Write a sequence for this structure.
């Protein structure tokens, strides 16, 4: 019943599906919640600040000063709920204090230091950062 048909039905005939593929293997990450920091020592009196910036894939702005280190994670907004300071005084490291400071739209790391020290910044994955503060021994 009709004239010529195919008026709104061209005639694409399917023959099954391609949907079965399980896109996934791993969970997502390891410390994958939201932006956070950690402090530890490694080797010999080195102050290691670990940084977990979830949703930041690139490199922060690290400012190396003798007084302190300033990392700025541009366009990474740290919740004030995650901003914590680690006093870490007398850990026998060149780090005097670790401070995760939320900035307006950025995240700022304030890693207070003193004297001569050495900064080795590491990225373990896009989002997981690490700052190894060695004492520059003279």
């Amino acid at each position: 019943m009709g004239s010529s048909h195919h008026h709104h039905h061209h005639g694409l005939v399917p023959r099954g599906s391609h949907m079965a593929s399980m896109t996934g293997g791993q969970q997502m990450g390891r410390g994958s919640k939201q932006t956070n920091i950690d402090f530890r020592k490694d080797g010999k009196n080195a102050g290691i600040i670990e940084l977990a910036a979830l949703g930041f894939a690139g490199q922060p702005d690290i400012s190396q000063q003798h007084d302190h280190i300033i990392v700025t994670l541009k366009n990474h907004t740290l919740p004030t709920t995650l901003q914590r300071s680690l006093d870490v005084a007398d850990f026998k490291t060149p780090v005097q204090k670790v401070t995760l400071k939320r900035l307006n739209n950025d995240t700022q790391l304030i890693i207070t230091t003193a004297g001569n020290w050495e900064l080795v910044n590491k990225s373990a994955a896009p989002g997981y950062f690490t700052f190894q503060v060695l004492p520059k021994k003279q």
The chain has one domain: 1-138. The first strand starts at residue 36 and ends at 42. The radius of gyration is 25 Å. Strands lie at 36-42, 46-52, 61-64, 68-73, 85-86, 95-102, 107-113, 117-125, 128-135.
